[PDB]
Design a protein around this ligand. Structure first.
Ligand SMILES: O=C(Cc1ccc(O)cc1)Nc1ncc(-c2ccc(O)cc2)nc1Cc1ccccc1
Length: 309
């Protein structure tokens, strides 16, 4: 089987260098963060957080829909995109969180922030919200780390896939063979990326070896109650209980159609009160298949949240 280019895409395409040239850099702790900032309408701030394999580039066709209503800020997570590397060489959830919260202190943010999170980016937003419950205006999430995975909800294939990723063979398939960028990322986009679009995702990870570490460390954080990192399992338990009780926090969940092993994500999202549910085309990296539908849904949700405030 083969996937097909979107025959109109080369005409609104944004290449890697075009996106990076629009970004800014800021020293943060012992490193630096590369980020997009639309600047205008700073009375609000919408912070878009990518997850594994990607970067701020993931949001390039989503963010123009929301810029007219609020300042939009989109970082490359540490070790990813064009950001600096992690000073301690480590790329666990809490390492990412250290740089993200330090970076927030430098951004002149409003008291209450809107988060838009994908995959592990949503975990970062959820954990920030749990620790800063008075700083959250709304949360948009999609393909998100909503809850732990109990052992009776863990089937053998996911058990063995995580065993593989936690083994030396898993380390080599990522660091030497770039599994998550070269295979997982295009496999979970329904269209075929233009060569220049794929090159933007490849570029941070084009060389072999340790530079690819964040794309191995993220799946190793998976919150399997059986065998998963205990600190991450507790972080996710804590913010899941907070989200289940957060009746006054407006949320938007963007469901993928058909998604990819996403049923537990959708079911977990349904346990959070005050959630608007929408659906767009996609597998996992749904920004690449339905960015304008997503941007329109988020724009309408943000306008409704601001109007009702
Ligand atoms: O590792 C993750 C991240 C995650 C997302 C949501 C969540 O609640 C917990 C963790 N996801 C993942 N990671 C791996 C696989 C996977 C791997 C192998 C396989 O054969 C099938 C699925 N699937 C998934 C998606 C998934 C599965 C089960 C419960 C929730 C989310």
């Amino acid at each position: 089987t083969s996937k097909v280019y979107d025959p109109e895409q080369r005409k609104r395409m944004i290449t890697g260098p075009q996106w990076w040239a629009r970004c800014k850099q800021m020293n943060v702790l012992d490193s630096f963060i590369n980020y997009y900032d639309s600047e205008k309408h700073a009375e609000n701030a919408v912070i878009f957080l990518h997850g594994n394999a990607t970067s701020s580039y993931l949001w390039r066709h989503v963010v123009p829909h929301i810029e007219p209503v609020a300042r939009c800020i989109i970082p490359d997570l540490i070790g990813m995109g064009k950001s600096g590397k992690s000073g301690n060489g480590s790329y666990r959830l809490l390492d990412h969180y250290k740089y993200l919260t330090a970076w927030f202190e430098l951004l002149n943010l409003p008291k209450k922030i809107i988060f838009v999170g994908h995959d592990w980016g949503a975990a970062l937003a959820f954990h920030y919200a749990y620790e800063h419950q008075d700083r959250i205006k709304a949360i948009v999430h999609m393909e998100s780390v909503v809850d732990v995975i109990e052992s009776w909800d863990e089937w053998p294939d996911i058990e063995e896939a995580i065993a593989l990723i936690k083994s030396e063979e898993g380390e080599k398939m990522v660091l030497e063979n770039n599994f998550f960028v070269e295979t997982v990322l295009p496999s979970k986009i329904m269209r075929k990326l233009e060569p220049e679009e794929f090159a933007a995702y490849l570029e941070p990870f084009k060389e072999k070896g340790e530079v690819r570490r964040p794309t191995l460390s993220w799946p190793r954080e998976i919150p399997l109650v059986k065998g998963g990192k205990p600190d991450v399992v507790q972080i996710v338990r804590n913010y899941n209980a907070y989200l289940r009780a957060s009746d006054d926090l407006p949320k938007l969940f963007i469901e993928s159609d058909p998604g990819f092993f996403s049923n537990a994500i959708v079911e977990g999202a349904k346990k959070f009160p005050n959630t608007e549910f929408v659906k767009v085309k996609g597998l996992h990296f749904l920004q690449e298949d339905a960015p304008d539908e997503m941007g329109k849904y988020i724009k309408s949700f943000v306008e409704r949240v601001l109007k009702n405030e």
